[PDB]
RNA sequence: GUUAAAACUCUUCUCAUGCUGGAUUCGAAAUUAGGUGCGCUUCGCGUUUAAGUC
């Protein structure tokens, strides 16, 4: 199941809402795999279809926690959804979220220029080859995830990136928290916002050990 | 195949008002309207009257 792990930088601000007024500090793998599946589509690949489902497991999409200065990758910390990465602290918090207003248009957003972590595992290897394909994709153009992305807010560019074969505490909620998604899909535009409770981290359901 | 798309941080408002390129310094220092040229040329103070007289 050789995976691919990535550096993913904002070249422009992100913006993603979690409801209830909650905020993330990082994007979820959720829109990576949103976002691929889009553009997959758009190259009118077979993977549109394994992605076309919402339910496919074939590749695994893994949140895209932010990749510290020093540190591997931020923890999330117990009930709570500040984020400390192992080596020194680096509380990316609700600081980079910043409050804007947009000709009456208020919300919130994410300082770009931080680093993101990536890593999509594909089990199946024509899975992967067509992984490595639209990864090239994701290489020489960019990636875009949160809200507000036709307008730009979500920009993302791989840095340095290596096809690495993969070889406990949840780093990414589990199906209470509600991770809310919707599968939009382009001919069937049924918009299905499924609130799946859950168990929440500090405790594309994932687990990182230590 | 992103709680997605769907929304231009937009409209109004002149770097403007005061402040003179002004002050100081003479176009004068040197040079003679000088050099050449005869107021010359033509025209006799002539004409008239006895030193008489007793």
Redesign the pocket.
Same mark, same amino acid.
């Given at each position: 199941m050789k995976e691919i792990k990535g550096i993913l930088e904002s070249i422009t601000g992100f =913006?993603?809402?979690? $409801?209830?007024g909650?905020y993330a500090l990082y994007?979820?793998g +959720?829109?990576? +795999?949103?976002?691929?599946?889009?553009?997959?589509?758009?190259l009118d690949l077979p993977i549109?279809?394994?992605?076309? $489902?919402?339910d496919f497991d074939d590749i695994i999409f893994r949140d895209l926690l932010p990749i510290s200065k020093c540190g591997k990758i931020f923890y999330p910390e117990k009930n709570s959804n500040s984020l400390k990465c192992p080596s020194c602290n680096e509380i990316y918090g609700s600081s980079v979220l910043r409050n804007?207003?947009? +000709?009456?248009?208020s919300?919130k957003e994410v300082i770009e220029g931080k680093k993101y972590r990536l890593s999509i595992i594909v089990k199946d290897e024509k899975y992967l080859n067509e992984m490595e394909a639209i990864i090239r994709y994701i290489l020489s153009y960019g990636?875009?995830?949160?809200?507000?992305?036709?307008?730009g807010?979500?920009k993302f560019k791989i840095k340095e990136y290596s096809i690495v074969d993969i070889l406990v505490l949840l780093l990414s909620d589990a199906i209470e928290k $509600?991770?809310?998604?919707?599968?939009?899909?382009? =001919?069937?535009?049924k918009?299905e916002?499924i +609130?799946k409770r859950g168990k929440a981290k500090g405790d594309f359901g994932e687990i990182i050990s230590l």
């Open positions: =913006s993603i809402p979690l $409801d209830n909650e994007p979820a +959720r829109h990576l +795999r949103g976002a691929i599946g889009y553009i997959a589509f758009n549109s279809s394994k992605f076309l $489902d919402f804007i207003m947009a +000709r009456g248009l919300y990636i875009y995830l949160g809200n507000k992305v036709s307008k807010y979500g $509600d991770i809310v998604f919707s599968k939009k899909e382009i =001919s069937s535009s918009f916002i +609130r």
